[PDB]
Design a protein around this nucleic acid. Structure first.
Ligand SMILES: [Mg+2]
Ligand SMILES: [Mg+2]
Ligand SMILES: [Mg+2]
Ligand SMILES: [Mg+2]
Ligand SMILES: [Mg+2]
Ligand SMILES: [Mg+2]
Ligand SMILES: [Mg+2]
Ligand SMILES: [Mg+2]
Ligand SMILES: [Mg+2]
Ligand SMILES: [Mg+2]
Ligand SMILES: [Mg+2]
Ligand SMILES: [Mg+2]
Ligand SMILES: [Mg+2]
Lengths: 145, 109, 195, 139
RNA sequence: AGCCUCGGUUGGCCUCGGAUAGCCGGUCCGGGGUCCGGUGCGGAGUGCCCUUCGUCCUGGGAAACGGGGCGCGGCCGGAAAGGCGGCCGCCCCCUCGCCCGUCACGCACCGCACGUUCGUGGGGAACCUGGCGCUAAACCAUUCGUAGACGACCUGCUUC
RNA sequence: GCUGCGGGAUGAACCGAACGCCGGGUUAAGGCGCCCGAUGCCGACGCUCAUCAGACCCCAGAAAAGGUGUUGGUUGAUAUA
C-alpha cells in the first residue's frame, strides 16, 4: 500500500470498486478517492485490512493534498429535537445529510489534479470504471493482484 | 456485482474415529488441493448462510429470511488443501455437504 | 453443477472410490457408459468371484435377502453403495446424487464427458496384466440388453461422427478467417500476455 | 516409434524437483533408474537424477562417456544449445505459461477487453465464409 | 397480494479409439503417400459469453448479419429417458448495442454483516379481468359363480 | 476383579495410557483409497500373477514333501586343442 495504488473496496457499501489511494491519516485509516466521473465514490475513509491492493501504480507524488481535512473532518453526527418517541424520525434522518460547498469543493480540487494523471495511462479510466468480481475459472490463492 | 467470496464445502467436524469435536469444523475450499496453497486463506472470515421461515433484521435493508453463522479460518488440515475453522456457534449437522462462503475481509496480501 | 464421468477405461473400484468421495461433498455425479468399466485380473477369475457372490443368498426366503443385480450400471451402483454409509440418512440422501446409466442417453449425449486419470487402466495396470470388461462379465450372467446397447452405441457414434465433422469444418473456417484478417487486428496484447 | 533415446550426450529438461525448469546433459546411465547429469551452462552441478524426473528433448551432443566439465561445456558451447533453445515451440509455450501465471489484474482486464474486439470480428467473418461455402455448394 | 420448503451466486451445444502411439492438414488412387504440430497450444493448467453502475453531446476502427421477440410460415433436425437450436421470406422499428478518446450529470448515505444470481425457484387454498373448449367415472346396494373362510375376483339391467 | 479413555472392525486380561469441568498446541500405540480424520507425496529400491493370491503379537487357521513358475546365492565340472 503505497501512495498512488489501486485498492478494491470489498466490505464497503460499494462491494468491490476500484479506488485510488492518496495518503495515510493519523488514526490509522486510509483516505482514498475514486474519480466521481469514473466511479461515483467521494473521498472515503477505508480500513487497511479491509482492502486488496493491486500491483498497479499511478504517479501521484504531486497530489498536493490539503491540510484542513483530517480524521475529524470525516465523522457521523446525529441529533434529535425530542427526547421521547414521536412520528418523525428524529427530524434528522428523514432528510439525509446533503452538506455542500465543502464536500464538493475539496473533491473538485483533488479530482481536477488526479484526472490528468489517470488519463495518461492508456486503459486506466475503464479499469477504474469496472467492478472487480470473482468468476468461476480463477481462485485468489493463484491470482496475482 | 459479481461474486466476492470463495466457495467451500462443509465435510464434517474435527473428529477421530469414535468421537467428534463440534467446536472445530473442516472445510474443503474449491481450487486448493495442496498444503502449500492454503496459507492465503488463513484468518479469512467464513459465513454459513441459510434461510428460515421467520424474517430477521439485516444490517442493510428490510428484514429478510436470511440467517448467517459467522466464523473464521484457524489453521490448515492435512496435505490435501483441507482447512480448519471455528465459528461463534457450532455448525448444525445438517450443513454437511453444503456451502460456506469464505470472504476476503481480513486481507494480508 | 453436474459431473458427467465416462465409464470406459476406468477401473471399477478406482473409479467408485472417487465417485463415493465426491458425492458426499454435494457434487451430483452421473457415470455414463458403465458397460466399458474394466476390472483387473483374469476374466475367469472375476467370473468366479461374481458366481461366489451369487451363491450367497438367504436360505429361508431368497426373495427377502441379498438382491443380486445383473446390469453393469447396477453393479457399479452397488459397488459405490458399499462405500457410502447407506444405512445413515446422510448416505441415503447422497445416494440420489449418483446416477449410473448404461449407454449414453439423450439427456447426456450432448454433454461433454469427463475422465478421471486416477482410475484409468492405462496408468493403473501394467500393459501385460489381464483385465475383464464389465459389459461382457454382466452379459455372461443374466444380462440380456447387450445387443441393443451396442446398437444404440453404434447409432450415437455415427451421429457424433457427423457432428465432429461439422465442428472440424467450423474450426477450419475459423482458422481461415483468422489468417485472412491479418490487418485491422493487431492484438499484440494477446501475444505479450500469451492468450 | 521411439524417436528419442537416453545416451551419452542427451540434453533433457527437468520437469519437477529442486532444479525444476532447467536443462541438463546426461553423461551416463547408472542403474537403469537414475543417470548422472552435468548441465554446466544451465547453472546446475553434477549429480544423479532419476529418469522419471527428467523429460527428453530433441537435441543431442557429442560427449565421451564420463567426461569432465571442461570437456562437456566446450561441446555445449559448440552445439550452441542455449540460444537455439528460445527458438523453439516448446520453450515458447513454457514462457507463455509463465507469463499467463504472472498476469496481473490490469493485464487480465486488458486481455478481457481485447478479446471483445478480437473474437467478434473473427465471428462476423466466419459468418460470411460459411455462407460463401453454402452458396458454393448450392449448385 | 400473501403462505410452506430447502439449495444454488455465469453458462462449457458431444467424434471413436490406442497408450511400443496418435492429432491436424490433404494432391492422387473407406485405406495408402506427403506436409505441420507432438511432455498435447485447432491445447479443459483450455476456449467462447464475459469482471457491466446508469444517462447525454461529440470523434477514430469494426460492423451491412442488422438487435432483443407477447409475432407468422416452411423442416421436425432428434426416440435410449425427445423440445431446444439453425436457416429463409416479413413484421413496431433500429446504424452511441463492440474497442479507444472526449465536455457534463445522477442515493457523493458520511469505514463496516445476511450484497449482487438460472426466481415470470417447487408445492398447496382462493381473489378481479380476456379468449378457446369439456359436460364423467369409481365405490356401496343388487345379481351372477368360470371365484369364494370374510374381503377379493369373473358377469347383467334397454323398455325392446 | 477395584478401571474408565485412544488403537486391535468386534472384545476381561493385548498395545499406549490411567480419569474434576473447559479452550489452544503436541504426542504415545495405531493409521492416511471410500465407509472414517489424515499421503490428493509428479515418494525410493526390489519381489509377486493365484481357475482357492496376499494383507499386522495375543487373534481365530496348518504340516511333512514336491515345482524345467520366476527371483538371488554356494560348491563344482566342460568349451576356439
Ligand atoms: Mg431370473
Ligand atoms: Mg467380587
Ligand atoms: Mg488397584
Ligand atoms: Mg486397566
Ligand atoms: Mg477401544
Ligand atoms: Mg510391553
Ligand atoms: Mg501397557
Ligand atoms: Mg485438548
Ligand atoms: Mg505411529
Ligand atoms: Mg477422509
Ligand atoms: Mg496356500
Ligand atoms: Mg482382529
Ligand atoms: Mg474364538
Amino acid at each position: 500500500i503505497t501512495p498512488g495504488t489501486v485498492l478494491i473496496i470489498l466490505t464497503g457499501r460499494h462491494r468491490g470498486k476500484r479506488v485510488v489511494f492518496l495518503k495515510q491519516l493519523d488514526s490509522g485509516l486510509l483516505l482514498v478517492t475514486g474519480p466521481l466521473v469514473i466511479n461515483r465514490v467521494p473521498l472515503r475513509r477505508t480500513h487497511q485490512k479491509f482492502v486488496i491492493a493491486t500491483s498497479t501504480k499511478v504517479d501521484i507524488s504531486d497530489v498536493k493534498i490539503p491540510k484542513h481535512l483530517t480524521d475529524a473532518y470525516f465523522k457521523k453526527k446525529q441529533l434529535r429535537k425530542p427526547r421521547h418517541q414521536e412520528g418523525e424520525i428524529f427530524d434528522t434522518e428523514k432528510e439525509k445529510y446533503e452538506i455542500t460547498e465543502q464536500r464538493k469543493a475539496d473533491q473538485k480540487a483533488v479530482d481536477l489534479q488526479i484526472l490528468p494523471k489517470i488519463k495518461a495511462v492508456p486503459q486506466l479510466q475503464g479499469y477504474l470504471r469496472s467492478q472487480f468480481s470473482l468468476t468461476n475459472g480463477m481462485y485468489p490463492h493463484k491470482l496475482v493482484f | 456485482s459479481g461474486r466476492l467470496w470463495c466457495k467451500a464445502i462443509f465435510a464434517g467436524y474435527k473428529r477421530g474415529l469414535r468421537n467428534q469435536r463440534e467446536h472445530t469444523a473442516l472445510l474443503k475450499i474449491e481450487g486448493v488441493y495442496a498444503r502449500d496453497e492454503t496459507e492465503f486463506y488463513l484468518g479469512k472470515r467464513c459465513a454459513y448462510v441459510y434461510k428460515a421461515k421467520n424474517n430477521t433484521v439485516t444490517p442493510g435493508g428490510k428484514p429478510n429470511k436470511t440467517r448467517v453463522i459467522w466464523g473464521k479460518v484457524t489453521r490448515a488440515h492435512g496435505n490435501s488443501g483441507m482447512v480448519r475453522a471455528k465459528f461463534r456457534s457450532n455448525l448444525p449437522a445438517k450443513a454437511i455437504g453444503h456451502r460456506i462462503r469464505v470472504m476476503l475481509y481480513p486481507s494480508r496480501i | 453443477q453436474v459431473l458427467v464421468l465416462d465409464g470406459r477405461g476406468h477401473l471399477l473400484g478406482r473409479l467408485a472410490a472417487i465417485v463415493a468421495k465426491q458425492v458426499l461433498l454435494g457434487r451430483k455425479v452421473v457415470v455414463v457408459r458403465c458397460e466399458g468399466i474394466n476390472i483387473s485380473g483374469n476374466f475367469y477369475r472375476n467370473k468366479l468371484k461374481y458366481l461366489a457372490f451369487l451363491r450367497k443368498r438367504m436360505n429361508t426366503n431368497p426373495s427377502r435377502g441379498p438382491y443380486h443385480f445383473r446390469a453393469p450400471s447396477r453393479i457399479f451402483w452397488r459397488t459405490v453403495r458399499g462405500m457410502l454409509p447407506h444405512k445413515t440418512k446422510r448416505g441415503q440422501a447422497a445416494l440420489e446424487r449418483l446416477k449410473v446409466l448404461d449407454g449414453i442417453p439423450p439427456p447426456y449425449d450432448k454433454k461433454k464427458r469427463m475422465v478421471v486419470p486416477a482410475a484409468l487402466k492405462v496408468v493403473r495396470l501394467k500393459p501385460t496384466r489381464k483385465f475383464a470388461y464389465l459389459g461382457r462379465l454382466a452379459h455372461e450372467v443374466g444380462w440380456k440388453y447387450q445387443a441393443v446397447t451396442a446398437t444404440l452405441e453404434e447409432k450415437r457414434k455415427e451421429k457424433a461422427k457427423m457432428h465432429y465433422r461439422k465442428k472440424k469444418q467450423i474450426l477450419r473456417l475459423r482458422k481461415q478467417a483468422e489468417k485472412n484478417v491479418e490487418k485491422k487486428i493487431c492484438k499484440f496484447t494477446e501475444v505479450l500476455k500469451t492468450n | 516409434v521411439f524417436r528419442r533415446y537416453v545416451e551419452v550426450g542427451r540434453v533433457a529438461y527437468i520437469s519437477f524437483g529442486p532444479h525444476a525448469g532447467k536443462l541438463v546433459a546426461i553423461v551416463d546411465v547408472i542403474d537403469q533408474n537414475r543417470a548422472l547429469v552435468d548441465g554446466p551452462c544451465t547453472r546446475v552441478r553434477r549429480q544423479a537424477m532419476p529418469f522419471k524426473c527428467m523429460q527428453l528433448t530433441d537435441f543431442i551432443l557429442k560427449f565421451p562417456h564420463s567426461a569432465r566439465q571442461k570437456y562437456v561445456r566446450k561441446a555445449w558451447e559448440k552445439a550452441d544449445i542455449n540460444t537455439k533453445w528460445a527458438a523453439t515451440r516448446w520453450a515458447k509455450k513454457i514462457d507463455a505459461r509463465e507469463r499467463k501465471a504472472k498476469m496481473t489484474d490490469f493485464d487480465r482486464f486488458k486481455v478481457m477487453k481485447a478479446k471483445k474486439m478480437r473474437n467478434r470480428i473473427i465471428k462476423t467473418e466466419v459468418k460470411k465464409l460459411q455462407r460463401a461455402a453454402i452458396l458454393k455448394a448450392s449448385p
